[PDB]
Every structure is written in structure tokens, then in C-alpha cells.
């Protein structure tokens, strides 16, 4: 495993928009063997989707309908990574 | 560290044929506290 060597960052984990695919990235396959587990919290629905990348990274994303402050928890091998949970509010339509 | 986790990849495929049927919760659950159990390298390729 290596919940420490876990990668975590993205323009969606900081915040996003209501009704707008919130993207992000969490890489940790190099850290070592281990299963991925995360808690996606939010006062609205949420459709997860794994999209590939040119570098082969792993940027997952999800859309939300409730405008306001939502939040997605984060866990590796079932281990809350430092600074958890990750607070992530939804801003208003880019405008 | 390169298989012990994958070994748990098939335990799930069966653990579902074990209890069969299915299970889920929502509606009466305002906060969508869902999760995502992704397995190393999902169906689609990457490396």
C-alpha cells in the first residue's frame, strides 16, 4: 500500500460548479499493491466515471446537481489519507 | 506487493454470486454517502 505515497490533486477537489463534471486525480498504483476505496459524499446525486489520459494517468470525475457546499471523502486501501476528509464545495456556474 | 491486492479482486466477483440478489440504499439518505471500489487497472487498459 502506501496511503502516504498517494497522489491527490485536481481542479475539482478544491471546488467545482453545480451540474458540471467535477474532475480530479488520485494515483497510487506505484505506491504498491492495495485496493482503492473512497466515500463520495454529497447532498445530490453523483455519477462516477473513469476516463483515460495521454499519460495513462487516472483522472476520475463526477457531476452534481445540488449547488452549494458538497464534500467527497478520500481513502486508500481503506485508510483516510492525511488532511481527511477532503472538503470540496460547488461554486456557481462559471459566470 | 503485486498480487495480494489482486487476489481480493476475484473474492468480490464471487462474494456477489454468494449472496446473489443485490443491495443498495438511497432516497431516505439525503447525504449521498456513496463510495468507489475501483480495482487496479479497471476493465479499460491504461499502462
Amino acid at each position: 500500500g502506501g496511503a502516504h505515497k498517494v497522489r491527490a490533486g485536481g481542479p475539482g477537489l478544491e471546488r467545482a460548479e453545480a451540474g458540471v463534471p467535477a474532475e480530479f486525480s488520485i494515483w497510487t498504483r506505484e505506491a504498491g499493491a492495495g485496493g482503492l476505496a473512497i466515500a463520495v459524499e454529497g447532498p445530490s446525486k453523483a455519477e462516477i466515471s473513469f476516463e483515460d489520459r495521454k499519460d495513462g494517468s487516472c483522472g476520475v470525475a463526477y457531476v452534481v446537481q445540488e449547488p452549494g457546499d458538497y464534500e467527497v471523502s478520500v481513502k486508500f486501501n481503506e485508510e483516510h489519507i492525511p488532511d481527511s476528509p477532503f472538503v470540496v464545495p460547488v461554486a456557481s456556474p462559471s459566470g | 506487493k503485486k498480487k495480494i491486492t489482486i487476489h481480493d479482486r476475484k473474492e468480490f466477483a464471487k462474494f456477489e454470486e454468494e449472496r446473489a440478489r443485490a443491495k443498495w440504499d438511497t432516497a431516505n439518505n439525503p447525504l449521498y454517502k456513496e463510495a468507489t471500489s475501483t480495482f487496479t487497472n479497471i476493465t479499460y487498459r491504461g499502462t
Partner: peptide, 21 residues
Amino acid sequence: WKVGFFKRNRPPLEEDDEEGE
């Protein structure tokens, strides 16, 4: 794996006595 594997199963359920130790 690690503590994960057994408590890893997200599905909140544990009727059998929790082994651990």
C-alpha cells in the same frame, strides 16, 4: 491489503465477531 482487506469491504456490515486479535 493491510488492515484494508477485511475492513476494506466498504459494505458496512459485520455480524460475525470482529477477529482482529
